[PDB]
Amino acid sequence: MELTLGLVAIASAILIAFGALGTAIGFGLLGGRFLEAVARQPELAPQLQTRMFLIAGLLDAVPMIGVGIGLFFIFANPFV
């Protein structure tokens, strides 16, 4: 009983916190490189920012997957 509840709660914490860590720092490095690049060529801000968002969308898929799994498990765990 209690052991299983703790197991699943800890699992959810793992997922969401650990994905949050990764996405946060990934944004850090990505934005740093993007700013470094755009500093060279202010002329291409629109298209460069376009590709920036194009890949920012690529980043966050499985972070959001983990967020959803954890949220549902918070609402309703499996293996009741």
Partner: protein
């Protein structure tokens, strides 16, 4: 509700819908057979598509194309350009092979974009017609493409192509052998433990789990899609019904890239097969 959830879950994971190797076809618990009674749907879709192509293949189109034939021309031009620019010096008619496999897996994963509940809903009328109503609700319907058996089939089919075109140039000498990463190392215990196992596992790994990974990664993506659908299906009253849409289009892009990179990997594998060893 959760009754309905488990009743859905009866359908998806193990495929071969209504397969019975001297067993039942509507039991969801036979767990003992060797028939794949779900491949036929994918095969029929592939056949009907290849005939849809044949309509224009038997035709010669050179003037001003309508939307249909215009798109046909851009598609075939791009695929031919890709297969050509990738690799060369190889005339055993493989470019159509890559084109076919790509577009079929394209359509096969494309067709899975529907709501999950609608396949059993339309099938419920056939169930009333034949083979029961609620004992169908657990697992009796034919399932659209989610079965990793199908994916496994494509993986090993391409693997067979790999083996046969590796011996296309009778690379049997290079096919049986391999370029060992190291014959041995000092600390002669290390030499003994390296001589026998290491280069052998090296040669094995160069090909084995690659198509396996291809197929089961397809399965992971596509299974992930279906399960996301099923989970979003909770509380379709106060929901805004906008949980999916972003992830859905993202996964659509994913599917596109899937098919594309699988056919890319096909190209590079057939190049290595056309490369002597």
């Amino acid at each position: 509700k959760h009754h309905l959830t488990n009743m859905t879950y009866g359908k998806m994971p193990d495929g071969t819908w209504k397969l019975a190797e001297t067993a039942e076809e509507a039991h969801s618990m036979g767990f003992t057979a060797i028939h794949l009674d779900s491949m036929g749907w994918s095969i029929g879709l592939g056949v009907i598509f290849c005939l849809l192509f044949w309509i224009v293949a038997r035709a010669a189109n050179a003037g001003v194309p309508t939307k249909f034939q215009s798109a046909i021309e851009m598609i075939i031009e791009f695929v031919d350009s890709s297969v050509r620019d990738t690799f060369h010096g190889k005339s055993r008619l493989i470019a159509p092979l890559a084109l076919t496999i790509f577009v079929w897996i394209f359509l096969m994963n494309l067709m899975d974009l529907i709501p999950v509940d609608w396949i059993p809903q339309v099938a419920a009328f056939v169930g009333a017609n034949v083979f029961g109503m609620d004992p169908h609700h657990v697992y009796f319907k034919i399932v659209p493409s989610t079965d990793p058996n199908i994916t496994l089939g494509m993986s090993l089919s391409v693997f067979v192509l790999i083996l046969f075109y590796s011996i296309r140039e009778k690379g049997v000498g290079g096919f049986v052998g391999e370029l060992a990463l190291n014959p041995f190392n000092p600390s002669n215990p290390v030499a003994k433990a390296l001589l026998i196992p290491v280069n052998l596992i090296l040669e094995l790994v160069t090909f084995l789990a690659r198509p396996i990974s291809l197929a089961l990664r397809l399965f992971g993506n596509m299974y992930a899609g279906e399960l996301i659908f099923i989970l979003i299906a909770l509380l379709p009253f106060w929901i805004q019904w906008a949980l999916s849409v972003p992830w859905a289009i993202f996964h659509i892009l994913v599917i596109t890239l899937q098919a594309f990179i699988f056919m890319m990997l096909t190209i590079v594998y057939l190049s290595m097969a056309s490369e002597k060893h």
